[PDB]
Amino acid sequence: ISGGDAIYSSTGRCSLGFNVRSGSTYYFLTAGHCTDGATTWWANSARTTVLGTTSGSSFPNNDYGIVRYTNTTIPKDGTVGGQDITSAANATVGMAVTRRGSTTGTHSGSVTALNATVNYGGGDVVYGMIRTNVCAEPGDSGGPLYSGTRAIGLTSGGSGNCSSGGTTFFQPVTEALVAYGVSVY
């Protein structure tokens, strides 16, 4: 399993962001709004293949979560689909980026602004977000935003869609890596 692939909780479907590790402990990052209130995660809609359990969740304010792998045999590729990821970096205005999600697949675009505030309403406000002109649709939450072999962010949300075009906000992955003391591989 790799970045962009579907992940299922008891509630719904999101996408796997990046496979990360700390020492010999493997985890995967995804959106905080997906890990919020979720305990167990599975690789299939049938919920027959277990992945692991939520180890941390931060939403709102931020939008990142982490899941500890409990499945010992499933491959944990340090890629996004077939794309190798070798490091993490900070987004910059004008940067060409790519997102992969379980609903829409792979779409590209550019970073149009940094440190954006997104109000999802009902007190769910997230801050310090990366704004882009990349689309995303339900199911794409938590998927990776990358640039070449560099990890940049995790899909949070936005408006519009892939047919008409849209605006999607991403949580900077560097902050998540730092909070959990993990690194991409």
Binding site: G12, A31, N119, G121, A136, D140, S156, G157, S159
Partner: protein, 51 residues
């Protein structure tokens, strides 16, 4: 599902589908509610889950 608190400028992108009266499966409640507002209140909920 209550859409009175809509519309909203942005929606998170998790998948928890709803079936609208236009036979379209809406990805999540926020997406569905924004569509209801956009339809000026003509769209309604048919049932929960995919159409």
């Amino acid at each position: 599902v209550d859409c009175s608190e809509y519309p909203k400028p942005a929606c998170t992108s998790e998948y928890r589908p709803l079936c609208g009266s236009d036979n379209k499966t809406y990805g999540n409640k926020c997406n569905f509610c924004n569509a209801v507002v956009e339809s000026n209140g003509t769209l309604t909920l048919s049932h929960f889950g995919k159409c």
